[PDB]
Amino acid sequence: ELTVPPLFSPIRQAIHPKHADIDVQTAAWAETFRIGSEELRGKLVTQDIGTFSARILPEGREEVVSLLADFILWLFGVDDGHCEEGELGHRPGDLAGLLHRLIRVAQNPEAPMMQDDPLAAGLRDLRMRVDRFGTAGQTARWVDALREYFFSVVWEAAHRRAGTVPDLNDYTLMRLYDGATSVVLPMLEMGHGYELQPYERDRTAVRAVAEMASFIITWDNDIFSYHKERRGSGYYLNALRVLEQERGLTPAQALDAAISQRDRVMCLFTTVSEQLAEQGSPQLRQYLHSLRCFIRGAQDWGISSVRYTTPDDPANMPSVFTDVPTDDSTEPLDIPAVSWWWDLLA
Ligand SMILES: [Mg+2]
Ligand SMILES: [Mg+2]
Ligand SMILES: [Mg+2]
């Protein structure tokens, strides 16, 4: 059983001043739309999801912070409710059908299908609010991001059904999306009332720093949520388990290897994003700031939420983040799916 040390983060804390109201309003939202079973919802409303959103969009427009918080709770509604603690999470094919239908609800709330499902009803409310604060492009990107997430958790469900653990390369590829990190990105733009143009947003290097944020956020989560996951009775996947199997490591060794990986991605992210900011648009500079807010917001929330601290069986969490890495090198990760990120240096 493990000790998680303070992790390296060069980003300063920030939070929206109305974080408390937002957290209350998200709990009310979960109740209004009856998101999750009574048991699951009871947990979710106590997990400071509004506070989390307030750290992701610390200077964002309040209505969007609220939208993002409701969305993050909805996402746990599907991820906990179906994928990790539901029957559909062992049935990749059935899962795929449900998620395809939910995509259609997100595209067309008016379509007379899944009119009885609470998750669908919640999604319609979210889409309606995306229509207020987003362009057509951002809305489609939000839907495409939902599909990315949905396709990756069907793949995760294949592993859960077979009880298998993917190799590091497959895990990384999967984990870039199955943490529902890319779905947040359009709302970062909406939160500040601008649209990131395709020539920047879809530029290979800008996509890369977005993936780096996803990697750091999911790896930091793997580290912080390890306790909560390992001690649960259900199947679980994370970087530590993958590294134990792949490199024949103990949990403690797997922890250190994981920390070294996210440290190197943290450093790369900072360097490449600074390069991009120097000659990017004002919108790109704001986007890159929001990626920092997302990473650090997930860091502060990860060590504080009862979702990870689990008071009934307390996690051993650090209280602070350090401002220097354990792994200082610019040696690329030995992971084919992401090693190309280091080609972006010059
Ligand atoms: Mg999950
Ligand atoms: Mg989970
Ligand atoms: Mg986790």
UniProtKB/Swiss-Prot annotation:
<keyword id="KW-0460">Magnesium</keyword>
<feature type="site" description="Plays a critical role in the stabilization of intermediate cation">
    <location>
        <position position="52"/>
    </location>
</feature>
<keyword id="KW-0479">Metal-binding</keyword>
<comment type="similarity">
    <text>Belongs to the terpene synthase family.</text>
</comment>
<feature type="short sequence motif" description="DDXXXE motif">
    <location>
        <begin position="79"/>
        <end position="84"/>
    </location>
</feature>
<feature type="binding site">
    <location>
        <position position="229"/>
    </location>
    <ligand>
        <name>Mg(2+) 3</name>
    </ligand>
</feature>
<feature type="binding site">
    <location>
        <position position="225"/>
    </location>
    <ligand>
        <name>Mg(2+) 3</name>
    </ligand>
</feature>
<dbReference type="GO" id="GO:0000287">
    <property type="term" value="F:magnesium ion binding"/>
</dbReference>
<comment type="function">
    <text>Catalyzes the conversion of (2E,6E)-farnesyl diphosphate (FPP) to yield the bicyclic sesquiterpene selina-4(15),7(11)-diene via a 1,10-cyclization, which requires the abstraction of the pyrophosphate from FPP leading to a (E,E)-germacradienyl cation. The only accepted substrate is (2E,6E)-farnesyl diphosphate (FPP).</text>
</comment>
<feature type="binding site">
    <location>
        <position position="228"/>
    </location>
    <ligand>
        <name>substrate</name>
    </ligand>
</feature>
<comment type="subunit">
    <text>Monomer.</text>
</comment>
<feature type="site" description="Plays a critical role for abstraction of the pyrophosphate group">
    <location>
        <position position="179"/>
    </location>
</feature>
<dbReference type="InterPro" id="IPR048143">
    <property type="entry name" value="Selin_dien_syn"/>
</dbReference>
<feature type="site" description="Plays a critical role for substrate recognition">
    <location>
        <position position="156"/>
    </location>
</feature>
<feature type="binding site">
    <location>
        <position position="84"/>
    </location>
    <ligand>
        <name>Mg(2+) 2</name>
    </ligand>
</feature>
<feature type="binding site">
    <location>
        <position position="221"/>
    </location>
    <ligand>
        <name>Mg(2+) 3</name>
    </ligand>
</feature>
<feature type="site" description="Plays a critical role in the stabilization of intermediate cation">
    <location>
        <position position="76"/>
    </location>
</feature>
<feature type="binding site">
    <location>
        <begin position="307"/>
        <end position="308"/>
    </location>
    <ligand>
        <name>substrate</name>
    </ligand>
</feature>
<dbReference type="GO" id="GO:0010333">
    <property type="term" value="F:terpene synthase activity"/>
</dbReference>
<feature type="binding site">
    <location>
        <position position="84"/>
    </location>
    <ligand>
        <name>Mg(2+) 1</name>
    </ligand>
</feature>
<comment type="pathway">
    <text>Secondary metabolite biosynthesis; terpenoid biosynthesis.</text>
</comment>
<dbReference type="GO" id="GO:0016114">
    <property type="term" value="P:terpenoid biosynthetic process"/>
</dbReference>
<dbReference type="InterPro" id="IPR034686">
    <property type="entry name" value="Terpene_cyclase-like_2"/>
</dbReference>
<protein>
    <recommendedName>
        <fullName>Selina-4(15),7(11)-diene synthase ((2E,6E)-farnesyl diphosphate cyclizing)</fullName>
        <ecNumber>4.2.3.181</ecNumber>
    </recommendedName>
</protein>
<dbReference type="Pfam" id="PF19086">
    <property type="entry name" value="Terpene_syn_C_2"/>
</dbReference>
<feature type="binding site">
    <location>
        <position position="79"/>
    </location>
    <ligand>
        <name>Mg(2+) 1</name>
    </ligand>
</feature>
<feature type="binding site">
    <location>
        <position position="175"/>
    </location>
    <ligand>
        <name>substrate</name>
    </ligand>
</feature>
<feature type="site" description="Plays a critical role for substrate recognition">
    <location>
        <position position="80"/>
    </location>
</feature>
<keyword id="KW-0456">Lyase</keyword>
<dbReference type="InterPro" id="IPR008949">
    <property type="entry name" value="Isoprenoid_synthase_dom_sf"/>
</dbReference>
